[PDB]
């Protein structure tokens, strides 16, 4: 069981890296989509105001 835990430590490190990658990817994708939509809406608002 000690040897199994020795391997499980590295396995958990890899799992943590994968989880961080997935979470940051999802968050950045949603944030960038919303930001692009807001920028387009703002430019349209400027033109409509003119």
């Amino acid at each position: 069981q000690s040897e199994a835990e020795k391997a499980r430590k590295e396995l958990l490190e890899l799992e943590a890296l994968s989880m961080a990658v997935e979470s940051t990817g999802t968050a950045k994708a949603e944030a960038e989509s919303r930001a692009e939509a807001a920028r387009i809406e703002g430019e349209g608002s400027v033109l409509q105001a003119k």
Partner: protein, 50 residues
């Protein structure tokens, strides 16, 4: 001189034979259990690595 003493000694020697056979069986069982535990541990570590 008496036959009953001979019968009792025959029963004693048969019990000694049974004792020897039981000892050998117990030793075989213990060795099998040890090997099974070693194989199980190696398999679990390999699963962790995979």
């Amino acid at each position: 001189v008496d036959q009953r003493t001979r019968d009792a000694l025959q029963r004693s020697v048969q019990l000694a034979i049974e004792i020897t056979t039981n000892s050998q069986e117990a030793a075989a069982k213990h060795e099998a259990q040890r090997l099974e535990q070693e194989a199980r541990g190696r398999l679990e570590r390999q699963k962790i690595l995979d």
